[PDB]
Design a protein around this ligand. Structure first.
Ligand SMILES: O=c1ccc2ncc(F)c3c2n1C[C@@]3(O)CN1CCC(NCc2cc3c(cn2)OCCO3)CC1
Ligand SMILES: [Mn+2]
Ligand SMILES: [Mn+2]
Ligand SMILES: [Mn+2]
Ligand SMILES: [Mn+2]
Lengths: 671, 674
DNA sequence: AGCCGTAGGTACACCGCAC
DNA sequence: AGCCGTAGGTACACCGCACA
């Protein structure tokens, strides 16, 4: 019994608060009136009774507890006269996931306790916004704002149209995705309460948020918010590859407070993935300690592990503090975070992405960096280049885990339409092992296949006699010798027939279903290969142009400051007189401007100069910096005057990155 | 569960026992899977010396080890059935790891003795400088620790059976006193092949016992803190998380303390901070919390992602003058940070907030006190070092719990203050009142210190259900933010309510005793102290802190005067100063020329070069003269203080008195006599 | 039918001492 | 007994989509 009941046993005047868990529950319990206010803390996202089978709804803990608590029974054994509270209040947290949970609770109430809604017994609390959850609020401010009958504003759930309600719960919570997807495309925007309205607004609120700020990557830098924030945090704390490894608990703590208002496990595990050479084609995090295995083992707890950027991540961040990309307010207006990273290499395609969102998902495979940039260079020289033509550069996916791809037709379809099915195979050979016996040796497995689960799958077949010919199965994999899975073949059995069966019946062959959905200008979009590169190139141009414009403004400010110091150096004797005959700093300022026709800034810079700056070498430093800066100023203006020069520079910086980080193709494309 | 090897030839097969999956992950990635099995355990294992058999055989990890080894236990042990000829204990390289090792060896000795006698039990030797094996890369762990070509495993040898029996009895057994005795005789408060089991258990257990005694479970007498709380407060100070500054995220606080100062689990840090923010736990709260921070009904805090914290105004006094060389700093656990050995502690925190701790061989239980009373005691002591405990009791009347209530009698308090030990009877505040129709009720508005309210309610509800008390018709917790604590016991019409109340005191936590046991760290050793010793040590701390501060401010003032003498010379002769700089090509030359030509020290010459041109304005020459004159008065004031001990002691009195007037409050707990 | 990866959520074993 | 408070350790419920 999680239920913290009230004293009074008079249902007319008793109410029950459904909260997300004990973090909310505590604040709730501390602030309530225990005479008339019961509390039932749940455990987060409840079951979707619209998608779930009947037997499993009834065997579900929180469903049981809610029913037990209400005292009515369910569906047809629902007696409204046995109800123990005339007020059932949904008080989930005031975030998108709170709205989602409320829709899930409503789905449950409408399907199994419909008459409870019809009796006007179901209510929605209205906690203040700007709180991640109720546990973040003090007890008194939760009582006054949300729970005190004297000041609270509860919304009574009313049911208007029964037909229309049915169509709503089926559409939003039902198993058919397309209908949901259609609702989101049609409706997306980039103190009674109608149940139909609440469902539609709450779900859209959740759907949208998961679509544009959680599960789908941005086309420009290929990142989800969590990754973008982990990387930015690493940048902000000077956690570069030349520095030592920093503790993960601080990385996580920092990202969670400043940028990512969600649980630590989502953050830590997203970071861990980026450090794994079998998950990321070009790892983004350089980890120290236990960071997981291909066998599905998780990483060590965050208190043990350490991390920093890889050298390549520096290229994601290069020039972020040179006004290249737009910054936005963080979740609470106390911080600033990047909307997008500079992304000086085409990361989306390089590393790919997979996200399960709402009404849609995404699945992009990784690619070879040498080939992608070559692709970008060709597009840059011909805006009208066909997909076929791009594919002379980018042969197909290139998986961190190597392996084989069967044929080109799936790739082609996927590059042209954004969708397509790519068959992946393990790299396997047949060899002798003595006495006329043979074995199969696997040294590379498909992308995202759990090796230990794959081995168990084979063993299970052996055992069930669903496959013939295998006498032994060993995972000889080693840190020192790499992946090595050995399948011994029964004497005189065709091992090639056995190998073929394994590809038919086990993850030893696996398909990658490409479904290339990314955020293009804030909206989810199914894109082909060209579109993906087009948006990327366009982003590289804005980055380098904005960088060049930044460096200019700053060069011009510094030259202006140096012009002041040189005037000063030229008339040093007269500059001293002016300052020495002045009572206050303000008087000296005004006099320096008047005597030598200096700006307010130049005068300040002169007054701030130390006596040290009068030594021979220091005087020469000022002159030397000034001459170097004039040459730099025109170098910048030249680039700004000519579009082709700019684009050329985007080409030369991409090339430089290709030469330094480009590497061999790993996945073999068999015809 | 077990991650077994390929081969089933036990002669060449080995099993590694690690503390959990963090360690096991690195171990499984680095191992030779042909001959090396891994059994990850789950932290501290059951101590079999203290447990009966039914408890042992139902412990999951014991069972998994038994099943893994395949030999059976006790009388049914069969060495021939061993699945591995090397059992390797490879716990983390920290004191808790040493402790887990001692627990496993205890188990092996009592249940698998022949396993040790055949030389099948080994101890791995992972490098130190790592919290757990999860901190290591799989290759580093293989090469230094598991690889048979470079590793240095320690084979456990049983030399003398009689002596090992006694060793397992003493160190792991239930008679605490012998363990305490063992620690006292051996505590110093300053490997290739074989390893005698007895030595291993002695050195490993002492290492853990010592570490828990001096650096975990016991408070320091000077500032009244344990390492975790000290590092929390220091953390809050270092990031300027003061009362006037906004609330800071708990996750940020904890991650920082965990990273730089306290190399342990997040739980221990957060939950410690949480307690410091609880007005029913701390007589004077050290942390100011925003969000769900728990309750007297035992509700924990909200998860740390939700809560935010900062220091209280009174914690600033714990930290006052910490950056004025008042206390000794030490290296952190890894050498990358500095941390304070002790806080200046400008109020008697040990006694004010109290402490309770379970250590090894000993424990501690010190109740909290009223700050006004404590300071007046301290002041009385400072004017009479020959003051008796009884006379000190005219200032300090007894403990004063954050939860208020009543204390029964003074004799318990007296014994506690005289000896360091004593039982103090604590009672709830309860009244009897009418409720209508000739019926009465008991109403409890205050409960004993460290009693969980809801649990006390459940124990009363249990009594009535079991009919081991009569006259109670109803029981409600009416506690509210508006009302305060209010527990109601409705009595049956015409039943004597006082007799019921009296039974409730005897049969439930409604009256609890506080077993005073005043053990604190004095000069880094655990010591049982009385009330006078606690004050005396605290006052000597204060005298040291104020003395060191005054010495610091004097070195600081004397340095500044010396700079200003060089700035006066410079400004007087500024034209010559400028020409000297201009004619100098480097700083090195400019330094050298200013020092000779103007009779300046290296520090003064540097100060002049660092001087900005704005510093040459007309009214600066006077501003510098005024500062220098005032520094000479200041230096004279400070020397006057260091010259006379009584002026220093008075200075301590004055600051303590100021603390009292600002932070001192009324007594909460009533001491009823008889 | 189960798994991929970002999300909401919480529980329970063990050590130590003392009364 | 089992509870006070620093320590070691880790697991399992839920949503959402698409593909075998
Ligand atoms: O292993 C198990 C097995 C079963 C189980 N059943 C229930 C339950 F609740 C739990 C369970 N657990 C663990 C757990 O306690 C849940 N954990 C609570 C603490 C969370 N991390 C705290 C944290 C640490 C930080 C930080 C932010 N947050 O920021 C930087 C500094 O370090 C992680 C999840
Ligand atoms: Mn929530
Ligand atoms: Mn450990
Ligand atoms: Mn009692
Ligand atoms: Mn017992």
């Amino acid at each position: 019994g999680k239920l913290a009941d009230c004293s009074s046993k008079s249902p007319e005047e008793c109410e029950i608060f459904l909260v997300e868990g004990d973090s909310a529950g505590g604040s709730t319990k501390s602030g309530r009136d225990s005479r008339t206010q019961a509390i039932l803390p749940l455990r987060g996202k409840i079951l979707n009774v619209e998608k779930a089978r009947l037997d499993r709804i009834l065997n579900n803990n929180e469903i049981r507890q809610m029913i037990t608590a209400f005292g009515t029974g369910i569906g047809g054994d629902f007696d409204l006269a046995k109800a123990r509270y005339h007020k059932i209040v949904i008080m989930t947290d005031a975030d998108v996931d709170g709205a989602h949970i409320r829709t899930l609770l409503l789905t449950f109430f409408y399907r199994f306790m419909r008459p409870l809604i019809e009796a006007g017994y179901v209510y929605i609390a209205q906690p203040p916004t700007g709180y991640k959850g109720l546990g973040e609020m003090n007890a008194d401010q939760l009582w006054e704002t949300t729970m005190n009958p004297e000041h609270r504003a509860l919304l009574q759930v009313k049911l208007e149209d029964a037909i229309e309600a049915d169509q709503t719960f089926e559409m939003l919570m039902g198993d058919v995705v397309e209908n949901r997807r259609q609702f989101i495309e049609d409706n997306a925007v980039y103190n009674e309460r109608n149940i139909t309205s609440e469902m539609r607004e709450s779900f859209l609120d959740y759907a949208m948020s998961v679509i544009v700020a959680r599960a789908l990557p941005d086309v420009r830098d290929g990142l989800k918010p969590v990754h973008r924030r982990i990387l930015y945090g690493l940048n902000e704390q000077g956690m570069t590859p030349d520095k030592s490894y920093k503790k993960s608990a601080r990385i996580v703590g920092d990202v969670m407070g400043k940028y990512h208002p969600h649980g630590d496990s989502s953050i830590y595990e997203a970071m861990v993935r980026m450090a794994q050479d079998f998950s990321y084609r070009y790892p983004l995090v350089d980890g120290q300690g236990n960071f997981g295995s291909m066998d599905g083992d998780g990483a060590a707890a965050m208190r043990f592990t350490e991390a920093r950027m890889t050298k390549i991540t520096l290229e994601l961040l290069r020039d972020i503090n040179k006004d290249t990309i737009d910054f936005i307010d963080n979740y609470d207006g106390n911080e600033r975070e990047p909307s997008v990273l500079p992304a000086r290499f085409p990361n989306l395609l390089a590393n790919g992405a997979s996200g399960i969102a709402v009404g849609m998902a995404t699945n992009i495979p990784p690619h070879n960096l040498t080939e992608l940039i070559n692709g970008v260079l060709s597009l840059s020289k011909n805006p009208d280049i066909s997909i076929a033509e791009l594919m002379e550069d980018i042969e197909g996916p290139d998986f961190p885990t190597a392996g084989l791809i069967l044929g080109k037709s799936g790739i082609r379809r996927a590059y042209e339409t954004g969708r397509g099915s790519i068959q992946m195979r393990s790299r396997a050979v047949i060899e002798e092992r003595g006495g006329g016996r043979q074995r199969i040796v696997v040294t590379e497995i498909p992308f995202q296949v759990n090796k230990a689960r794959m081995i168990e799958k084979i063993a299970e077949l052996v055992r069930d006699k669903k496959i013939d010919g295998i006498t032994d199965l060993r995972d000889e994999t080693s840190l020192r010798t790499g992946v090595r899975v050995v399948i011994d073949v029964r004497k005189d059995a065709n091992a090639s027939v056995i190998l073929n069966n394994l590809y038919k019946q086990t993850p030893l062959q696996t398909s990658f279903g490409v479904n290339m959905i990314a955020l293009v200008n804030g909206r989810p979009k199914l894109i082909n290969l060209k579109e993906a590169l087009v948006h990327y190139l366009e982003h590289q141009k804005t980055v380098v142009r904005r960088r060049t414009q930044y460096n200019l403004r700053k060069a011009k400010d510094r030259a202006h400051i140096l012009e002041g110091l040189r005037i000063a150096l030229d008339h040093i004797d007269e500059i001293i007189s002016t300052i020495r005959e002045s009572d206050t700093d303000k008087v000296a300022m005004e006099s320096l401007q008047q005597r030598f026709k200096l700006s307010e800034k130049q005068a300040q810079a002169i007054l701030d100069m130390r006596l040290r700056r009068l030594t021979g070498l220091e005087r020469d430093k000022i002159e030397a910096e000034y001459n170097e800066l004039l040459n730099y100023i025109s170098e910048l203006e030249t680039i700004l005057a000519d579009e082709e020069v700019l684009l050329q520079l985007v080409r030369d910086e991409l090339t430089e990155i290709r030469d330094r980080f480009g590497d061999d193709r790993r996945t073999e494309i068999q015809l």
